[PDB]
Design a protein around this nucleic acid. Structure first.
Length: 225
RNA sequence: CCCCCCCCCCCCCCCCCCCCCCCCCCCCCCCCCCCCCCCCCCCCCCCCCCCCCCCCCCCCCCCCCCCCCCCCCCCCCCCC
């Protein structure tokens, strides 16, 4: 685990996090490991981190006390894990995050409300998940959100009520690639506050569905398609 | 030569309630085993593409060297 300012533990087959590192480290990387559990009790010493890349590992579920100890954590990477369950208190105490990757966690459904308790989030990733609807909450949140990725999901319909959350959000990227959406609801994109870019790569529309898509983009601020 | 009415004690049967003890079924939680699917760690094997390295072979170019063939010149000498 070589580290001078950047802490790297890539491809080192770690089972538990190390406990001998400088306190003032900002980024700590443990990609490509098998941290089966990530206890919060081992991070008493680690309280000055900003980015935490713990992706490509085998974490089952997370605890609220993990980011209690981190008041300055800003990047939280959970790529290729088993975090299939989310709760209101999963990301409650930590709200300074501006980056949150959840690619390939086999997330099935968003139950009630995982993302109100943060307002400074910028980029949200939900690629390679089992989501079938774009509903991520009940009320309106993610005011400062700009980047949203939902590629390689199992979404077949893009309903207007599913995007009522983003009535006051400026979104520059809606990554909905590799999802077999076959129905478009009126006002689905008008519910979005500020839509700037739509990405529908590898998605089977056809000419008629493309025409309906363009009709649904009437009177909006889209820049890229 | 008889019936009736009171009372004690002990029975038997029947309905209700409360106890233990057990059986069957079911619920909840936990453990073990088997099967299916998925993720990650490595160490890899096979195939294709791309890039280089060595050696070698064919063809070509350039510079030659030797030999053969042809032509010209210089000097010397004869024939009529």
């Amino acid at each position: 685990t070589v580290s001078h300012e950047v802490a790297d533990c890539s491809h080192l087959k770690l089972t538990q996090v190390p406990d001998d590192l400088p306190t003032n480290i900002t980024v700590l990387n443990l990609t490509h490991n098998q941290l089966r559990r990530l206890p919060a009790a081992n991070f008493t010493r680690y309280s000055q981190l900003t980015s935490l890349d713990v992706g490509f590992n085998t974490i089952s579920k997370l605890e609220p006390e993990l980011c209690q100890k981190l008041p300055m954590l800003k990047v939280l990477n959970l790529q290729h894990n088993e975090l299939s369950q989310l709760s209101d208190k999963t990301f409650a105490f930590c709200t300074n995050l501006t980056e949150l990757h959840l690619m390939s966690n086999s997330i099935q459904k968003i139950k009630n409300n995982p993302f109100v308790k943060q307002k400074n989030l910028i980029t949200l990733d939900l690629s390679h998940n089992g989501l079938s609807s774009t509903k991520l909450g009940t009320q309106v949140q993610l005011e400062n959100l700009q980047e949203l990725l939902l590629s390689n999901n199992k979404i077949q319909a893009l309903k207007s009520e599913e995007l009522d959350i983003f009535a006051n959000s400026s979104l520059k990227k809606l990554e909905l690639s590799s999802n077999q959406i076959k129905e478009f609801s009126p006002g689905c994109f008008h519910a979005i506050g500020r839509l700037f870019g739509l990405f529908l790569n590898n998605v089977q529309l056809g000419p008629s569905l493309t025409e309906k898509l363009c009709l649904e983009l009437a009177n909006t601020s889209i820049r890229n398609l």
